[PDB]
Write a protein that binds this ligand. Structure first.
Ligand SMILES: *[P@](=O)(OCC)N(C)C
Length: 377
């Protein structure tokens, strides 16, 4: 039945996927997230991928390229869509498991739609947070309630750090990110239990649809690279999250105190080319006989294989810009997504058929490695 439509792949699951944005409150300390969810309507595939010019300006700043690159990126990618139905109604059905997703350094909430849409197509609600810790290439917020209804945006761009700042600011940021993940969860749970919430963005989607929609027993946190460190910090702080999946986690931000505080299952899915010994050693600090830990490495992949820019360009250009690895981008994301589904079934107790991919958790595939290729004897 399935066939190619958008550059970013459609979900492999049985459900069509809707998408909307939620900001509450309006401030630099409020929650900002992009929601993906099972929808009934299948037509539209009309969610704009990068919805504001300032994100392209932010990406240029993050890349350290000349100011005009922002304009060029906007020209190239400003009309790009992702295969989700903008503001489509939530599919009625059984309570849905929930994932809170954390983006990497230089990213923002909309850049992991291949992951969000795949999860939603298999029956998850996914809340992709936008962080206000100055790790996003760009984000926005407002000065007051009137500026929200008026729409005078204040933009906040990635903070570049001096070496002496790395050694404390990254930790401050990961703690803020964990707070933001827990706060996003609380916001979604408030909406689930019927607390009125006023979206600071004016959008068609009525949040009251989400009343009684969440399976409060089946909540996980997933994140890429800074987001992988965020997974670990969040699990250590918030037991409402029952398991975590870290995608090419970047471990540098984390303090030593976190490891002993994570009873929950944790899955590391790594790229072949990003990882390095100092990082792997910190992953190993998470291992203990009393804790469930799994690790796989995707053969021929780079850290950008987890993010949507891996689909944005052709093979040759993508490889040159290190947006693509040697492996095909759909092969890689399918492995990550299927292994994730199996892990989530196992540790959230889902009554689905994702256990068909149990072997992927063990790295048993021609394009996977159990554990790591990195040596640190
Ligand atoms: P990570 O947060 O991945 C970039 C999206 N990192 C390499 C710091």
């Amino acid at each position: 039945a399935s066939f190619g439509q958008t550059k970013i792949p459609r979900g492999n699951g049985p459900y069509s996927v809707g998408c909307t944005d939620l900001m509450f409150d309006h401030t630099n300390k409020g929650t900002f997230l992009r929601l993906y969810y099972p929808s009934q309507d299948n037509d539209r595939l009309d969610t704009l991928w990068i919805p504001n010019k300032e994100y392209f300006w932010g990406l240029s700043k993050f890349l350290g390229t000349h100011w005009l690159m922002g304009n060029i990126l906007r020209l190239l990618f400003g009309s790009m869509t992702t295969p989700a139905n903008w503001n489509s109604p939530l599919r009625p059905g059984e309570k849905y498991p929930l994932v809170v997703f954390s983006h990497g350094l230089g990213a923002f909430r909309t850049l992991y739609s291949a992951i969000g849409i795949d999860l939603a197509s298999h029956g998850f609600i996914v809340a992709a947070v936008e962080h206000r810790d100055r790790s996003a290439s760009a984000t926005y917020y407002f000065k007051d309630q009137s500026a929200a209804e008026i729409g005078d945006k204040s933009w906040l761009y990635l903070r570049t750090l001096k070496q002496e700042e790395e050694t404390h600011i990254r930790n401050e940021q990961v703690r803020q990110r964990a707070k933001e993940c827990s706060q996003a969860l609380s916001l979604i749970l408030d909406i689930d239990h019927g607390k009125p919430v006023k979206n600071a963005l004016d959008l068609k989607f009525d949040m009251e649809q989400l009343k009684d929609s969440i399976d409060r027993e089946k909540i996980a946190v997933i994140g890429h690279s800074f987001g992988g460190a965020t997974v670990i910090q969040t699990l250590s702080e918030d037991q409402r999250f029952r398991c975590g999946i870290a995608l090419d986690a970047w471990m540098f931000p984390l303090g030593d105190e976190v490891y002993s505080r994570i009873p929950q299952p944790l899955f590391f899915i790594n790229s072949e080319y990003f990882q390095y010994p100092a990082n792997i050693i910190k992953m190993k600090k998470c291992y203990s006989p009393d804790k469930e830990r799994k690790m796989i490495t995707i053969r021929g992949s780079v850290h950008q294989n987890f993010a949507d820019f891996t689909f944005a360009t052709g093979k040759i250009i993508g490889h040159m810009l290190k947006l693509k690895g040697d492996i095909d981008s759909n092969v890689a994301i399918d492995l990550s997504n299927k292994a994730s589904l199996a892990f989530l079934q196992k540790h959230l107790g889902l009554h689905k058929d994702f256990d068909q991919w149990d072997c992927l958790i063990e790295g048993d595939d021609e394009n996977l490695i159990p554990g790591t290729n990195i040596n640190t004897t």
